[PDB]
Amino acid sequence: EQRVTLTNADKVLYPATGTTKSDIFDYYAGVAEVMLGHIAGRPATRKRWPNGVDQPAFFEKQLALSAPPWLSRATVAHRSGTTTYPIIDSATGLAWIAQQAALEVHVPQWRFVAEPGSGELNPGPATRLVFDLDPGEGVMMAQLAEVARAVRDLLADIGLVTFPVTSGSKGLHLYTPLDEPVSSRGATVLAKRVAQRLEQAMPALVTSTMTKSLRAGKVFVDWSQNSGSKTTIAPYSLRGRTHPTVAAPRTWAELDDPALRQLSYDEVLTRIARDGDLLERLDADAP
DNA sequence: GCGGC
DNA sequence: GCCGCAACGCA
């Protein structure tokens, strides 16, 4: 029986805009339906600002022993330790998220799948690819959206559909559902090849190695977040920046608008009221 | 934000 | 009151 009590409702987590815990709480109730599909079955990494975006935050992955018993969870082994993650898959789970002041929710591109037998959750294959397009110092949007279309076209050549999401920060994330789910290892190799093929077509506009030295006036097409041990901001997640911006799904037509900007939480709310989930095809097989 | 100390 | 609360890929 899922219950969550909001405390400090009027406490401001975004000093610049007066955005409160209750605002955040309402936002996540507002997006639950369209957001859940994309984080369902996935280990939820939280980044938390209990005292607002002008105060120290922390990453949290392990689930606290005192977190509500009804939260679904699963365990991931990694290079030097085990970790039990929460899995958010209900509106109440996003209520907890908001009460926790977990402004940001991050997930990998794979989901847990049950063991043949009786339900032990283990990491499954990548169900989608993500690309992170990071604009170097002084990089035009004409450069950013041109690169995003180029990635789209490459992926289309191999039968894949691509959905753009402004990261709410500086980035631009592109997601592709896989009709043939593959290992995170394979997905990474595939993504790397795409990033690299693109680099070769427009070396002055695109780079595929992260090294900050080759990162000025160029778009860095980051392919590495398809690694199974990496994580990416969830679609619809708030960002812990001075403004309550969101990893907002966009249309390709919107990318054609030179007046493309990062959206705030409330703009996202009305867009949903207008168009529902642009990312509806992304996780059509979600739990 | 919240429990362990 | 104080403190922790992640751990990639190679920096």
Cβ contact A55 with chain B strand, < 7 A: no
| Spatial contact of A111 and A126, defined as CB atoms under 8 Å apart | no
Hey, what amino acid is at A267? E
Residues 194-223 of A with CB within 7 A of strand C: 210
Determine the nucleotide nearest to A100 by Cα–C1' distance: B1
Q: What is the resolution of this structure in A?
A: 2.4
Written as one string, the DSSP assignment of A151-198 is HHHHHHHTT---EEEE-SSS-EEEEEEEEEEE-HHHHHHHHHHHHHHH
**Residue A233 region, left (φ>0) first, then alpha (ψ -120 to 50), else beta?**
beta
Q: Is A23 annotated as a binding residue?
A: no
Q: Per residue, what are the HEC states of A211-276?
A: CHHHCECCEEEECHHHCCCCCEECCCCECCCCCCEECEECCHHHHHCCCCCCCEHHHHHHHHHHHC
Cβ contact A75 with chain C strand, < 7 A: no
Determine phi and psi for A115, rounding to 5 degrees. -70, 135
Which residue approaches C8 most closely, CA to C1'?
A230
Which residue approaches B3 most closely, CA to C1'?
A66
Q: How many Å separate Cα A147 from the centre of its chain? A: 20
Q: How many CA atoms lie within 13 A of A235 on its CB side?
A: 30
CB atoms within 10 A of CB A201: 10
Nearest in space to A204 (alpha carbons), one of A148, A136, A256, A157? A136
Q: Is A42 annotated as a binding residue?
A: no
**Cα three-residue angle A245-A177-A118, rounded to 5 degrees:** 105
Nearest in space to A239 (alpha carbons), one of A43, A29, A86, A27? A27
For CATH 3.30.70.3300, the residue range(s) in chain A are: 126-263
H or E element in which residue A29 lies: helix A21-39
C-alpha A223/C-alpha A188 separation (Å) is 7
In CATH, A126-263 is 3.30.70.3300: yes
C-alpha A94/C-alpha A99 separation (Å) is 9
